[PDB]
UniProtKB/Swiss-Prot annotation:
The chain holds residues 449 to 722 of 766 of the full protein. It comes from Homo sapiens (Human). This is Serine/threonine-protein kinase B-raf. Protein kinase involved in the transduction of mitogenic signals from the cell membrane to the nucleus. Phosphorylates MAP2K1, and thereby activates the MAP kinase signal transduction pathway. Phosphorylates PFKFB2. May play a role in the postsynaptic responses of hippocampal neurons. There is a cross-link at K127 (Glycyl lysine isopeptide (Lys-Gly) (interchain with G-Cter in ubiquitin)). Brain and testis. Changing N130S: In a colorectal adenocarcinoma sample; somatic mutation. Monomer. Homodimer. Heterodimerizes with RAF1, and the heterodimer possesses a highly increased kinase activity compared to the respective homodimers or monomers. Heterodimerization is mitogen-regulated and enhanced by 14-3-3 proteins. Heterodimerizes (via N-terminus) with KSR1 (via N-terminus) or KSR2 (via N-terminus) in a MAP2K1-dependent manner. Interacts with MAP2K1 and MAP2K2. Found in a complex with at least BRAF, HRAS, MAP2K1, MAPK3 and RGS14. The lineage of its organism: Eukaryota, Metazoa, Chordata, Craniata, Vertebrata.
Length: 249
Protein backbone atom coordinates (compact mmCIF):
# COMPACT_ATOMS: atom_id res chain seq x y z
CA UNK A 1 0.00 0.00 0.00
CA UNK A 2 2.95 2.27 0.81
CA UNK A 3 5.23 0.70 -1.82
CA UNK A 4 7.34 3.03 -3.97
CA UNK A 5 7.63 1.78 -7.58
CA UNK A 6 11.13 1.24 -8.94
CA UNK A 7 12.93 4.12 -10.63
CA UNK A 8 11.44 6.88 -8.47
CA UNK A 9 14.05 6.71 -5.70
CA UNK A 10 17.47 8.19 -6.46
CA UNK A 11 20.15 6.85 -4.11
CA UNK A 12 22.98 9.20 -3.17
CA UNK A 13 25.83 9.45 -0.68
CA UNK A 14 26.40 6.63 1.80
CA UNK A 15 26.10 7.40 5.52
CA UNK A 16 26.29 4.21 7.58
CA UNK A 17 26.79 0.47 7.34
CA UNK A 18 26.59 -5.53 7.91
CA UNK A 19 22.90 -6.29 7.43
CA UNK A 20 22.10 -3.02 5.67
CA UNK A 21 23.41 0.38 4.64
CA UNK A 22 21.70 3.78 4.71
CA UNK A 23 22.02 6.50 2.06
CA UNK A 24 20.83 10.06 1.63
CA UNK A 25 18.30 10.07 -1.20
CA UNK A 26 15.96 12.22 -3.27
CA UNK A 27 12.27 11.30 -3.47
CA UNK A 28 10.07 14.40 -3.68
CA UNK A 29 12.88 16.09 -1.77
CA UNK A 30 15.53 15.01 0.70
CA UNK A 31 14.94 11.52 2.13
CA UNK A 32 16.95 8.77 3.81
CA UNK A 33 16.98 5.22 2.41
CA UNK A 34 18.00 2.14 4.41
CA UNK A 35 18.82 -0.67 1.98
CA UNK A 36 19.47 -4.40 2.29
CA UNK A 37 22.72 -5.67 0.73
CA UNK A 38 22.26 -12.60 1.20
CA UNK A 39 19.25 -11.44 3.25
CA UNK A 40 19.10 -13.39 6.50
CA UNK A 41 15.69 -14.75 7.58
CA UNK A 42 15.99 -12.63 10.72
CA UNK A 43 16.99 -9.62 8.61
CA UNK A 44 13.92 -10.12 6.42
CA UNK A 45 11.83 -10.49 9.59
CA UNK A 46 13.19 -7.23 11.03
CA UNK A 47 12.45 -5.51 7.71
CA UNK A 48 8.82 -6.64 7.89
CA UNK A 49 8.43 -5.61 11.53
CA UNK A 50 10.03 -2.18 11.05
CA UNK A 51 7.58 -1.38 8.25
CA UNK A 52 4.71 -2.71 10.36
CA UNK A 53 5.64 -0.62 13.39
CA UNK A 54 6.59 2.53 11.46
CA UNK A 55 3.38 2.68 9.41
CA UNK A 56 1.38 2.73 12.67
CA UNK A 57 3.26 5.88 13.79
CA UNK A 58 2.21 9.46 12.89
CA UNK A 59 3.91 11.76 15.41
CA UNK A 60 6.19 14.76 14.90
CA UNK A 61 8.89 13.56 17.31
CA UNK A 62 8.84 10.07 15.76
CA UNK A 63 10.91 9.69 12.60
CA UNK A 64 8.55 10.10 9.66
CA UNK A 65 8.21 6.85 7.71
CA UNK A 66 7.65 7.74 4.06
CA UNK A 67 7.54 4.28 2.49
CA UNK A 68 9.30 1.06 1.57
CA UNK A 69 10.80 -0.29 -1.65
CA UNK A 70 11.12 -3.88 -2.88
CA UNK A 71 11.86 -4.01 -6.62
CA UNK A 72 15.60 -3.12 -6.85
CA UNK A 73 16.30 -4.20 -3.28
CA UNK A 74 14.52 -4.24 0.06
CA UNK A 75 14.61 -0.70 1.42
CA UNK A 76 12.80 1.65 3.80
CA UNK A 77 12.67 5.39 3.08
CA UNK A 78 12.21 8.02 5.79
CA UNK A 79 12.39 11.79 6.11
CA UNK A 80 15.84 13.37 5.92
CA UNK A 81 16.93 14.98 9.19
CA UNK A 82 19.49 17.79 9.08
CA UNK A 83 21.71 17.96 12.15
CA UNK A 84 23.27 15.56 14.63
CA UNK A 85 22.11 13.17 17.33
CA UNK A 86 21.72 14.16 20.97
CA UNK A 87 24.74 12.04 21.94
CA UNK A 88 26.99 13.94 19.52
CA UNK A 89 25.79 17.36 20.70
CA UNK A 90 26.29 16.67 24.41
CA UNK A 91 29.43 14.52 24.52
CA UNK A 92 31.20 15.04 21.18
CA UNK A 93 30.49 18.66 20.17
CA UNK A 94 31.14 20.05 23.68
CA UNK A 95 28.29 22.54 23.14
CA UNK A 96 26.48 23.83 26.22
CA UNK A 97 22.70 24.11 25.90
CA UNK A 98 20.44 26.66 27.50
CA UNK A 99 18.29 25.07 30.20
CA UNK A 100 15.13 26.00 28.26
CA UNK A 101 16.35 23.99 25.27
CA UNK A 102 17.26 21.04 27.52
CA UNK A 103 13.81 20.83 29.11
CA UNK A 104 12.33 21.32 25.63
CA UNK A 105 14.41 18.38 24.38
CA UNK A 106 13.26 16.21 27.29
CA UNK A 107 9.71 17.46 26.72
CA UNK A 108 9.84 16.57 23.02
CA UNK A 109 11.38 13.14 23.67
CA UNK A 110 8.71 12.52 26.32
CA UNK A 111 5.96 13.19 23.76
CA UNK A 112 7.27 10.70 21.21
CA UNK A 113 7.97 7.98 23.78
CA UNK A 114 4.52 8.44 25.33
CA UNK A 115 3.08 8.22 21.82
CA UNK A 116 4.95 4.95 21.21
CA UNK A 117 3.83 3.38 24.49
CA UNK A 118 0.28 4.58 23.83
CA UNK A 119 0.43 2.55 20.60
CA UNK A 120 1.70 -0.49 22.58
CA UNK A 121 5.09 0.03 20.91
CA UNK A 122 8.30 -0.62 22.87
CA UNK A 123 11.50 1.14 21.78
CA UNK A 124 13.83 -1.48 23.20
CA UNK A 125 17.01 0.58 22.66
CA UNK A 126 16.43 4.18 23.78
CA UNK A 127 19.51 6.33 24.30
CA UNK A 128 21.04 9.69 23.42
CA UNK A 129 22.42 8.22 20.18
CA UNK A 130 18.90 7.27 19.06
CA UNK A 131 17.59 10.83 19.54
CA UNK A 132 18.11 13.01 16.47
CA UNK A 133 17.70 16.79 16.40
CA UNK A 134 16.09 17.79 13.11
CA UNK A 135 17.55 21.18 12.25
CA UNK A 136 18.45 21.89 15.89
CA UNK A 137 15.04 22.41 17.53
CA UNK A 138 12.90 19.36 16.69
CA UNK A 139 13.83 15.93 18.06
CA UNK A 140 13.18 12.75 16.07
CA UNK A 141 13.20 9.34 17.76
CA UNK A 142 14.32 6.37 15.69
CA UNK A 143 16.45 3.24 15.53
CA UNK A 144 19.63 4.80 14.16
CA UNK A 145 21.54 1.53 14.48
CA UNK A 146 25.98 -4.26 23.73
CA UNK A 147 26.98 -0.71 22.77
CA UNK A 148 24.28 0.82 24.98
CA UNK A 149 24.84 -0.77 28.39
CA UNK A 150 24.65 2.58 30.20
CA UNK A 151 20.95 2.94 29.30
CA UNK A 152 20.04 -0.65 30.21
CA UNK A 153 17.83 -1.16 33.25
CA UNK A 154 18.82 -3.49 36.12
CA UNK A 155 16.37 -6.23 35.07
CA UNK A 156 17.50 -6.31 31.43
CA UNK A 157 21.12 -6.45 32.64
CA UNK A 158 20.35 -9.44 34.87
CA UNK A 159 18.40 -11.28 32.16
CA UNK A 160 12.79 -8.24 30.56
CA UNK A 161 12.27 -5.55 27.90
CA UNK A 162 9.12 -3.58 28.72
CA UNK A 163 7.73 -0.08 29.18
CA UNK A 164 9.61 -0.01 32.49
CA UNK A 165 12.89 -0.66 30.66
CA UNK A 166 12.09 2.22 28.29
CA UNK A 167 11.33 4.77 31.02
CA UNK A 168 14.59 3.86 32.76
CA UNK A 169 16.45 4.58 29.52
CA UNK A 170 14.60 7.91 29.44
CA UNK A 171 16.07 8.60 32.88
CA UNK A 172 19.67 8.32 31.67
CA UNK A 173 18.83 10.70 28.82
CA UNK A 174 17.54 13.08 31.49
CA UNK A 175 20.82 12.57 33.35
CA UNK A 176 22.75 13.24 30.14
CA UNK A 177 20.74 16.39 29.38
CA UNK A 178 20.98 17.88 32.87
CA UNK A 179 24.53 16.88 33.80
CA UNK A 180 25.94 17.24 30.29
CA UNK A 181 28.03 14.07 30.52
CA UNK A 182 27.64 10.31 30.36
CA UNK A 183 26.55 8.47 33.52
CA UNK A 184 29.01 6.40 35.54
CA UNK A 185 31.75 8.79 34.41
CA UNK A 186 33.93 7.93 37.42
CA UNK A 187 34.40 4.30 36.37
CA UNK A 188 35.80 -0.79 33.93
CA UNK A 189 32.81 -1.81 31.82
CA UNK A 190 32.53 -5.16 33.62
CA UNK A 191 32.71 -3.27 36.92
CA UNK A 192 29.80 -1.07 35.81
CA UNK A 193 27.74 -4.05 34.59
CA UNK A 194 28.11 -6.04 37.81
CA UNK A 195 27.56 -3.06 40.12
CA UNK A 196 24.56 -1.70 38.22
CA UNK A 197 23.16 -5.19 37.63
CA UNK A 198 23.39 -6.05 41.33
CA UNK A 199 21.99 -2.60 42.17
CA UNK A 200 25.16 -1.41 43.92
CA UNK A 201 25.75 1.42 41.42
CA UNK A 202 23.51 4.33 40.41
CA UNK A 203 24.18 7.61 38.57
CA UNK A 204 25.49 10.50 40.68
CA UNK A 205 22.70 13.08 40.87
CA UNK A 206 25.00 15.61 42.58
CA UNK A 207 26.83 16.20 39.27
CA UNK A 208 23.68 17.89 37.94
CA UNK A 209 23.92 21.54 36.92
CA UNK A 210 22.82 24.23 39.37
CA UNK A 211 20.09 25.60 37.08
CA UNK A 212 18.38 22.18 37.00
CA UNK A 213 14.83 22.52 38.39
CA UNK A 214 14.06 20.65 41.61
CA UNK A 215 11.13 18.85 39.98
CA UNK A 216 13.33 17.58 37.14
CA UNK A 217 15.84 15.98 39.52
CA UNK A 218 13.01 14.34 41.46
CA UNK A 219 11.43 13.25 38.18
CA UNK A 220 14.83 12.02 36.97
CA UNK A 221 15.34 10.03 40.17
CA UNK A 222 11.86 8.50 39.86
CA UNK A 223 12.66 7.17 36.38
CA UNK A 224 15.91 5.64 37.68
CA UNK A 225 14.11 3.62 40.38
CA UNK A 226 15.59 0.13 40.69
CA UNK A 227 12.16 -1.43 41.17
CA UNK A 228 10.47 -1.79 37.78
CA UNK A 229 6.96 -1.17 39.13
CA UNK A 230 8.25 1.88 41.03
CA UNK A 231 8.99 3.70 37.77
CA UNK A 232 6.28 6.14 36.60
CA UNK A 233 4.45 5.75 33.32
CA UNK A 234 5.12 7.96 30.31
CA UNK A 235 1.70 9.70 30.49
CA UNK A 236 2.57 10.82 34.03
CA UNK A 237 6.09 12.04 33.25
CA UNK A 238 4.97 13.77 30.04
CA UNK A 239 2.34 15.68 32.02
CA UNK A 240 4.93 16.59 34.66
CA UNK A 241 7.50 17.92 32.17
CA UNK A 242 4.90 19.80 30.14
CA UNK A 243 3.44 21.29 33.32
CA UNK A 244 6.96 22.30 34.38
CA UNK A 245 7.70 23.57 30.87
CA UNK A 246 4.43 25.51 30.97
CA UNK A 247 5.36 27.16 34.28
CA UNK A 248 8.76 28.14 32.89
CA UNK A 249 7.07 29.20 29.62
C1 LIG B 1 22.31 8.93 11.94
C2 LIG B 1 22.26 8.90 10.42
C3 LIG B 1 23.12 7.79 9.83
N1 LIG B 1 20.89 8.73 9.98
N2 LIG B 1 20.24 7.56 9.96
C4 LIG B 1 19.01 7.77 9.52
C5 LIG B 1 17.93 6.70 9.33
C6 LIG B 1 17.08 5.88 9.17
C7 LIG B 1 16.00 4.82 8.94
C8 LIG B 1 15.74 4.40 7.64
C9 LIG B 1 14.76 3.44 7.40
C10 LIG B 1 14.04 2.90 8.46
C11 LIG B 1 14.31 3.34 9.80
C12 LIG B 1 13.60 2.80 10.89
C13 LIG B 1 13.87 3.23 12.17
C14 LIG B 1 13.09 2.64 13.34
C15 LIG B 1 12.86 1.28 13.39
C16 LIG B 1 12.15 0.74 14.44
C17 LIG B 1 11.66 1.56 15.44
C18 LIG B 1 11.88 2.92 15.39
C19 LIG B 1 11.34 3.83 16.50
F1 LIG B 1 10.56 3.09 17.35
F2 LIG B 1 12.38 4.37 17.20
F3 LIG B 1 10.59 4.83 15.95
C20 LIG B 1 12.60 3.47 14.34
N3 LIG B 1 14.83 4.17 12.40
C21 LIG B 1 15.53 4.69 11.37
C22 LIG B 1 15.27 4.27 10.03
C23 LIG B 1 18.87 9.18 9.24
C24 LIG B 1 17.86 10.05 8.77
N4 LIG B 1 16.56 9.53 8.42
N5 LIG B 1 18.12 11.35 8.64
C25 LIG B 1 19.31 11.84 8.96
N6 LIG B 1 20.29 11.07 9.41
C26 LIG B 1 20.09 9.73 9.56
Amino acid sequence: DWEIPDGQITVGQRIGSSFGTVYKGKWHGDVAVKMLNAPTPQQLQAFKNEVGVLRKTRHVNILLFMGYSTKPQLAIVTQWCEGSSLYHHLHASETKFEMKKLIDIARQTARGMDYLHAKSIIHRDLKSNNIFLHEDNTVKIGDFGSGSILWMAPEVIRMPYSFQSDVYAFGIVLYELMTGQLPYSNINRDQIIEMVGRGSLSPDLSKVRSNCPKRMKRLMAECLKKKRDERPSFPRILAEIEELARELS
